[PDB]
Write an enzyme that holds these catalytic residues in place. Sequence first.
Site, PDB file in Angstrom:
ATOM      1  N   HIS A  83      -0.961  -0.370   3.028  1.00 43.17           N
ATOM      2  CA  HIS A  83      -1.062  -1.854   2.942  1.00 43.17           C
ATOM      3  C   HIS A  83       0.318  -2.543   2.932  1.00 43.17           C
ATOM      4  O   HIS A  83       0.364  -3.798   2.992  1.00 43.17           O
ATOM      5  CB  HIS A  83      -1.952  -2.253   1.777  1.00 43.17           C
ATOM      6  CG  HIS A  83      -1.402  -2.021   0.407  1.00 43.17           C
ATOM      7  ND1 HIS A  83      -1.937  -1.066  -0.426  1.00 43.17           N
ATOM      8  CD2 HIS A  83      -0.519  -2.731  -0.337  1.00 43.17           C
ATOM      9  CE1 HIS A  83      -1.331  -1.121  -1.602  1.00 43.17           C
ATOM     10  NE2 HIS A  83      -0.462  -2.140  -1.581  1.00 43.17           N
TER      11      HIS A  83
ATOM     12  N   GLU B 208      -4.515   5.871   2.763  1.00 40.51           N
ATOM     13  CA  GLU B 208      -3.680   4.794   2.156  1.00 40.51           C
ATOM     14  C   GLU B 208      -2.225   5.255   2.022  1.00 40.51           C
ATOM     15  O   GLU B 208      -1.447   4.518   1.408  1.00 40.51           O
ATOM     16  CB  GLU B 208      -4.253   4.348   0.809  1.00 40.51           C
ATOM     17  CG  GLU B 208      -3.787   2.949   0.350  1.00 40.51           C
ATOM     18  CD  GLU B 208      -3.855   1.802   1.354  1.00 40.51           C
ATOM     19  OE1 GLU B 208      -4.717   1.879   2.256  1.00 40.51           O
ATOM     20  OE2 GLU B 208      -2.981   0.858   1.280  1.00 40.51           O
TER      21      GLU B 208
ATOM     22  N   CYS C 114       2.572  -0.945  -7.023  1.00 36.65           N
ATOM     23  CA  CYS C 114       2.172  -0.262  -5.764  1.00 36.65           C
ATOM     24  C   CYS C 114       3.394   0.445  -5.173  1.00 36.65           C
ATOM     25  O   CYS C 114       4.472  -0.182  -5.115  1.00 36.65           O
ATOM     26  CB  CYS C 114       1.502  -1.215  -4.784  1.00 36.65           C
ATOM     27  SG  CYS C 114      -0.191  -1.617  -5.289  1.00 36.65           S
TER      28      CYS C 114
END
Length: 182
Positions: free
Chosen positions: A41, A72, A148
């Site tokens: 992302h 991911e 993240c």
Amino acid sequence: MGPGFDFAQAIMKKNTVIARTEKGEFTMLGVYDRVAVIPTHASVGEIIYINDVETRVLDACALRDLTDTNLEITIVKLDRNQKFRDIRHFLPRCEDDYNDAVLSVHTSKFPNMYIPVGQVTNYGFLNLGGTPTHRILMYNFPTRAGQCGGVVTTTGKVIGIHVGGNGAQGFAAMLLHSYFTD
Ligand SMILES: NS(=O)(=O)c1ccccc1OC(F)F
């Protein structure tokens, strides 16, 4: 404070950079040579900022499993003038549960941050921001957006990178030795 934090610190001090894309600042784990990982992302492009230096991206690959499900993890090769310490021997070979993990973050917003997240479950399937995702690790800590890319370690192992949470739990994508065979 203890041998968990000792191992986490040793990884952060030599194998992390601050990565900036158009989607924000991320902790980014260097694994070997000029090869690093980041959450998919982050939307890596042709150019990325590495410790505030404009860097060409030589290759970027969004990993998927053999069911064609999102993992991911994006593997990035950086046009950098320096290699990372090779830490591939600290990667697990198989999917597993863990005790007593640390999540470590280093950005402008959160420098030198270390969180004892405790027990890590092999959670497996997660609908992550609407995207079916496999090989997810779960820990019971209220993580924020700024974590993240954070590195998840136990003593002797680098097991994952933080990719999300639901306010009460945090979620990491597994790192496996098999992703970084050259
Ligand atoms: N871990 S975090 O990103 O939620 C965070 C950030 C700044 C201060 C405290 C804090 O932890 C909170 F859980 F205590």
